Each structure stands twice: as C-alpha cells, then as structure tokens.
C-alpha cells in the first residue's frame, strides 16, 4: 500500500488535468460571465471522454503486469505475496474509484519554464529521428 500511493493519485490528476485545459477552451470560445451548473457539468464530463479508457486500462495494466509475482513459491512467496495483494487491491480501488467518484468530486468541487527547456530538444529530436532511436539503443 506504500508503493500504491504514488499511482492512486496519478489516476486522479491525469483526469483533472485534461479537464483544466478543457475548461480553458469553452472559456475562450464562449463568453466568461455566463455559466450554469449544467454548463460546468458538460465540460468536465467531456475530459472523461478521452482519457477515460486510457487510465482505467493503464491501471488495469499496472495491476495485471504484476500478477506473475504471485507465482513465487515457498518462503519468498509468503513474503512478497501479501505485498502484491495490497498493491493490487489499492490500485483496483483508485482505478474503480476514478470512474465512479473521482470525475464527480472534481465536478462538485511556472509550467512555462519547463516547457521552455523541453521543446528545444524535442524539435531537435525531429531531426533525423532515426538517430535518436540510435542513441537510445546505446543507453
């Protein structure tokens, strides 16, 4: 449950985020001082349109790409067995919560200077991209 904590929250935010920029376009395409409880209802439940499947299945990946560990026999299995169990239940919790409670609780309730350092090297990667699949292979 200690290692799970870093993913239960990663489940929520990636949904909250695509909803922060979804509520930054219906604000640039429409007025600004006119919005109802249904006008706010539609915008957040339209961020769950895209990322929806993306995460519940990616935390379905986190929970299943771990199953093989249960095949640990004897002493070591009795040890990390219980760890795998709790890590999994706690994920199935946050995952099956980000589809019943998370979208709702977020509806009932300096990024510049990292974007500046990334994309100079991003476009640089688009130079001969086949050369960066070569440096990677060297890593």
């Amino acid at each position: 449950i200690a290692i799970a904590v870093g993913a239960m929250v990663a489940a929520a935010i990636v949904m909250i985020e695509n909803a922060h920029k979804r509520l930054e376009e219906w604000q640039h395409q429409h007025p600004d001082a006119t919005l109802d409880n249904k006008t706010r209802w539609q915008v957040i439940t339209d961020a769950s349109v895209e990322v929806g499947p993306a995460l519940f299945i990616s935390l379905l990946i986190i929970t299943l790409s771990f199953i093989p560990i249960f095949t640990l026999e004897g002493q070591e299995g009795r040890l990390f067995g219980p760890l795998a169990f709790t890590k999994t239940y706690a994920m199935a919790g946050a995952a099956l919560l980000a589809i019943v409670v998370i979208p709702i609780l977020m509806g009932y309730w300096l990024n510049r200077f990292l974007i500046r350092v990334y994309h100079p090297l991003l476009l640089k990667v688009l130079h001969w991209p086949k050369t960066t699949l070569l440096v990677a292979a060297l890593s």
């Binding site: 439940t45 929806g52 519940f56 299945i57 040890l79 067995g81 979208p103 709702i104």
Partner: protein, 44 residues
Amino acid sequence: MIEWIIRRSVANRFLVLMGALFLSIWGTWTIINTPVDALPDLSD
C-alpha cells in the same frame, strides 16, 4: 465501454457519493481493528 460506465456513475451521483462515504467510515473501523505482525508467516 469505460466512457459509458463513467456516464452511468455521473448519473448515479449522490447515491454513489453516500456509498463512498459509508465505505470511508467502514474502511476506518476495519483498519483500527486490524491484527498486526512484523512480517507475514514465512515458515513451512
């Protein structure tokens, strides 16, 4: 299938809310009364 499942829950909201509330109070009782030990039993 996930999207439809998001929509149905959003519809439920406020019956769902109280379920996650009663779970939170129930998930607080069990924890308090949970046995304890250094490690899981590993002996054969």
